[PDB]
Amino acid sequence: SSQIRQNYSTEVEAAVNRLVNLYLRASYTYLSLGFYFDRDDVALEGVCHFFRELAEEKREGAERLLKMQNQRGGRALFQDLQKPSQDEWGTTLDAMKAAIVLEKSLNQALLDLHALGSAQADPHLCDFLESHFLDEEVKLIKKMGDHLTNIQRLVGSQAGLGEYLFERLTLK
Amino acid sequence: SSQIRQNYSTEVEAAVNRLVNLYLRASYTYLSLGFYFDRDDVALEGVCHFFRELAEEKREGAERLLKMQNQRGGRALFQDLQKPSQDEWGTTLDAMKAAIVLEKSLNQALLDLHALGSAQADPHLCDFLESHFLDEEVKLIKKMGDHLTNIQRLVGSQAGLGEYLFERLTLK
Amino acid sequence: SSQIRQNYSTEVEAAVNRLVNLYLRASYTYLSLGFYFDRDDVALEGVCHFFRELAEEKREGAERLLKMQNQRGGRALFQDLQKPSQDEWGTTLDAMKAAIVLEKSLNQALLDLHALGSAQADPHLCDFLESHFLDEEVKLIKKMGDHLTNIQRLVGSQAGLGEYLFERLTLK
Amino acid sequence: SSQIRQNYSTEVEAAVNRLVNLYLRASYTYLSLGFYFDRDDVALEGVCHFFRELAEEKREGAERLLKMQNQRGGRALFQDLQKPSQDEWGTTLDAMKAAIVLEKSLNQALLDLHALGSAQADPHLCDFLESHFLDEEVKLIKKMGDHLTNIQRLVGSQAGLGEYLFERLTLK
Ligand SMILES: [Cl-]
Ligand SMILES: [Cl-]
Ligand SMILES: [Cl-]
Ligand SMILES: [Cl-]
Ligand SMILES: [Cl-]
Ligand SMILES: [Cl-]
Ligand SMILES: [Cl-]
Ligand SMILES: [Cl-]
Ligand SMILES: [Cl-]
Ligand SMILES: [Cl-]
Ligand SMILES: [Cl-]
Ligand SMILES: [Cl-]
Ligand SMILES: [Pt+2]
Ligand SMILES: [Pt+2]
Ligand SMILES: [Pt+2]
Ligand SMILES: [Pt+2]
Ligand SMILES: [Pt+2]
Ligand SMILES: [Pt+2]
Ligand SMILES: [Pt+2]
Ligand SMILES: [Pt+2]
Ligand SMILES: [Pt+2]
Ligand SMILES: [Pt+2]
Ligand SMILES: [Pt+2]
Ligand SMILES: [Pt+2]
Ligand SMILES: [Pt+2]
Ligand SMILES: [Pt+2]
Ligand SMILES: [Pt+2]
Ligand SMILES: [Pt+2]
Ligand SMILES: [Pt+2]
Ligand SMILES: [Pt+2]
Ligand SMILES: [Pt+2]
Ligand SMILES: [Pt+2]
């Protein structure tokens, strides 16, 4: 219906709105992860900073999707944001595992939207995702994987010491 | 139960968590307001920028409350974020009226928490709100009031022209 | 037949030549639009400057397509350039409507060439269009849409005043 | 009796003098803690520096209280300073626990004086404490809590190694 809208399906428009919800949900999860690591009885500030930065990045991702939605003449529709899956996130290992699962879920949503765009013959959409989201997700998942490996190596024996050292020497 | 917690009631802890929810809800409302004014069929970029900046400020407010919650040995608890009250926000006048109602609701929540802190004899809480929230809200509400007055003066006659001029000469 | 040519169909080569013609035609239309707004009896210099800049951008687009045609070992073939569709372009509203129709026609030609490249399995072509044309067109069409909305809002009542203000406060 | 004194009760004046004694006692405790960690058979210089800085901060606190006492037309009265509670402070964990207990005792004295000021309707006093003492104490107690958590995590196994690493990588 927009004067500008061209080659932009209702199916893609709706999936973009869903993806915005997913990115904002992810941002909210990272906010909870960050503040958990800032608790006085957890106290791993490099971990808190890692997750707070991710909270920012996912919010930024949502805003880029909303910008794009408006550029194509789609209509942003916001839904309720579901609270994060946990109130307490365990150890740095637990938290990093939860983060990689979240990232893989966002990546899968990106890949699903890419496939939809390809089926709807919407190359602007495909370029947009390739240019601003797909590579960023692959890089982030690789970093997280690297972190998991390092954390697991450290907490095999002397879990406390290992968690401290990872925060001090990798994250901080 | 925290090793650090001192003079910090369960009632205040819970009300802080509720206030975080309110600020994040407000931020989400301002995100929707901003992107509405960025629609091709609305196209008032100074208005979009005004509301996007407010979205940032309310998120920052929530983060300051969460920082404080952890400093006092309280435990952050996140809930679902309710979607904004509207999908479409009407004219700049409608939007500014919706914003002032939202701000007044946040202000009332601040005043209610202040009164609770006073009843619980929690001066750190009272100082915190006075120092970082109460004055900021009064300033913002005054600015919004000033904007409403200017918008109403402009759209009495020639509503379209007036909306354009307010965006160009006040907001931009 | 070129020593360099690889995976570059005759169908794509020909469509590239047609697209060059379309971009040069568009540039010529924008030259006519610009000089119309520079007439002493029209005299909207911000509008003239807007369209003259677009004339440059479309010429640049044509030159990028010709560069690419030579990089792939295709052969540039020039045709006659049809004169613009009008000698006089009416108001700023009329002109902006004519511009968005032109841009949408260029966008459709880009999307058609993209689909051809996809059918001919020519990813260099698809990347080229994605990287240098598709996003630029979406951005431009969005800007034009925003302008139309602003012009329409202004000329509902007091058409003359509104046209002056849009030129002074948006375009200039 | 002072020419300047206004709305400044004898009860507050006396409690201010007691608080000065408490801050100077605290400073003296931190001096003993610092020099203990500088012993050749303890030798944790980051710990020594942490506590020596706190000794300075508490002396500064006392001096601010004495300044204020004179600004309100009260009369400073000094008492004997009791020696610190220990001659030897054990491990970094023991020492940090002793420090947080001391800080909580100072915080409680601040809160008690705040309540007295509120009962005596002395807002200059309440502002003074809020502005210069209450927030500083909450921040310090949170930091100490964070340190305790980190030290405990480190000395669960390999107590010696953990104490070294905390001094090197957090305190130094
Ligand atoms: Cl559709
Ligand atoms: Cl930090
Ligand atoms: Cl849920
Ligand atoms: Cl309680
Ligand atoms: Cl903008
Ligand atoms: Cl709702
Ligand atoms: Cl061929
Ligand atoms: Cl000029
Ligand atoms: Cl013709
Ligand atoms: Cl008295
Ligand atoms: Cl030293
Ligand atoms: Cl003694
Ligand atoms: Pt940080
Ligand atoms: Pt960082
Ligand atoms: Pt694709
Ligand atoms: Pt881009
Ligand atoms: Pt990007
Ligand atoms: Pt902006
Ligand atoms: Pt701004
Ligand atoms: Pt108060
Ligand atoms: Pt503050
Ligand atoms: Pt502040
Ligand atoms: Pt110009
Ligand atoms: Pt220009
Ligand atoms: Pt493609
Ligand atoms: Pt390129
Ligand atoms: Pt380019
Ligand atoms: Pt030192
Ligand atoms: Pt220092
Ligand atoms: Pt007070
Ligand atoms: Pt002061
Ligand atoms: Pt101060």
Curated annotation (Swiss-Prot), chains A, B, C, D:
Domain of life of the native organism: Eukaryota
Gene3D superfamilies (UniProt xref): 1.20.1260.10
Residue numbers binding Fe cation: 53, 56-57, 60, 63
Positions carrying N-acetylserine: 1
Compartment(s) of residence: Cytoplasmic vesicle, Autophagosome; Cytoplasm; Autolysosome
All copies of domain Ferritin-like diiron, residue ranges: 6-155
Any single Gene Ontology cellular-component annotation: autolysosome
InterPro entries, sorted: Ferritin, Ferritin-like, Ferritin-like_diiron, Ferritin-like_SF, Ferritin_CS, Ferritin_DPS_dom
A biological-process GO annotation: iron ion transport
Keyword Metal-binding: yes
Residue numbers spanned by region Catalytic site for iron oxidation: 53-60
Keywords, comma-separated and alphabetical: Acetylation, Cytoplasm, Cytoplasmic vesicle, Iron, Iron storage, Lysosome, Metal-binding
Gene Ontology MF term list: ferric iron binding; ferrous iron binding; iron ion binding
Function of the protein: Stores iron in a soluble, non-toxic, readily available form. Important for iron homeostasis. Iron is taken up in the ferrous form and deposited as ferric hydroxides after oxidation. Also plays a role in delivery of iron to cells. Mediates iron uptake in capsule cells of the developing kidney. Delivery to lysosomes by the cargo receptor NCOA4 for autophagic degradation and release or iron.
Membership in a protein family: Belongs to the ferritin family.
Summary of subunit composition and partner proteins: Oligomer of 24 subunits. There are two types of subunits: L (light) chain and H (heavy) chain. The major chain can be light or heavy, depending on the species and tissue type. The functional molecule forms a roughly spherical shell with a diameter of 12 nm and contains a central cavity into which the insoluble mineral iron core is deposited. Interacts with NCOA4.
More about this protein: In horse spleen the light chain is the major chain.
Protein name: Ferritin light chain
UniProt source species: Equus caballus
